[PDB]
């Protein structure tokens, strides 16, 4: 099906505790494959998935040089942001960036992304046209004016439509045994009384990849959206994910409830119920 590559950059100032830290991670879909941390003993871009390890020294040296230069540019950007927001040199601040490309099932570029944030709030985003910007506030409008004058969007577009897609396709091929394999959830319903007249039904999904999943409870065939406790999808640590959805139901009515599971690794959506032993 569809696939994406995304890089996530975090730059964090820390006055009195040295220069700002820069961390970068790269993902294909929900699989991390590279990392960089300026606080490492010897900062280098490092492999985090087995299928990237085959890349040669030119790859690793080039990515490391890029990340080091990026760290330096973000240190400058943190200083500039102080001027844009009338802020003092004593506070700690964070710039974040996420960017990359999505391919559709056919393998063509579906769309590109490049968004940045300051202190956890939208700052500036490249529009879907890969040609214009959306600035979140008057500071980001200064950046937008600079980037328009310097034709930065054209550079981003060339990367997103070119290198980003070409390298994502390479990674998908080199990692095809895992990146192009969906693992369907293992599912079951548990039952736990809360009292004599109510019980929790919890619908579990375990061991699935990729992370996108839909778990829903129905009562008499009607979705229980506002009555369902849904935990955030969470990583197991073996590449797969876990999730559960729970409802509190009147005792004796358990059989009126059905859990519905949608996942890319399933041929059809599943319906499950509590199965008393």
């Amino acid at each position: 099906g569809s696939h994406s590559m995304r890089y996530f950059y975090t730059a964090m100032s820390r006055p009195g505790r040295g220069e700002p830290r820069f961390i970068a991670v790269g993902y294909v879909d929900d699989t991390q494959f590279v990392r960089f941390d300026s606080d490492a003993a010897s900062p280098r871009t490092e492999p985090r998935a087995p299928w990237i390890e085959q890349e040669g020294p030119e790859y690793w040296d080039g990515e490391t040089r890029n990340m080091k230069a990026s760290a330096q540019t973000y240190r400058e950007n943190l200083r500039i942001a102080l001027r844009y927001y009338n802020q003092s040199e004593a506070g700690s601040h964070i710039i974040q960036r996420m960017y990359g490309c999505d391919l559709g099932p056919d393998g063509r570029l579906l769309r590109g992304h490049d968004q940045s944030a300051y202190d956890g709030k939208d700052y500036i985003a490249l529009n879907e046209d890969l040609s214009s910007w959306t600035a979140a506030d008057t500071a980001a409008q200064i950046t937008q004016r600079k980037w328009e004058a310097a034709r930065v969007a054209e550079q981003l577009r060339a990367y997103l439509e070119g290198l980003c897609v070409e390298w994502l396709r390479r990674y998908l091929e080199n990692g095809k045994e895992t990146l192009q394999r969906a693992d369907p959830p293992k599912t079951h319903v548990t039952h736990h009384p809360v009292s004599d007249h109510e019980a929790t039904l919890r619908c579990w999904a375990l061991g699935f990849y990729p992370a996108e999943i839909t778990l829903t409870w129905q009562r008499d065939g009607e979705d229980q959206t506002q009555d369902t406790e849904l935990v955030e999808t969470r990583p197991a640590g073996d590449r797969t994910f876990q999730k559960w959805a729970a409802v509190v139901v009147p005792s004796g009515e358990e059989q009126r409830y059905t859990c519905h599971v949608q996942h890319e690794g399933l041929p059809k959506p599943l319906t499950l119920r509590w199965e008393p032993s």
């Binding site: 970068a24 990026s70 400058e76 310097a150 290198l163």
Partner: peptide, 8 residues
């Protein structure tokens, strides 16, 4: 493969 960073 990573892209480039410019000044804000």
């Amino acid at each position: 493969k990573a892209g480039q960073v410019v000044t804000i």
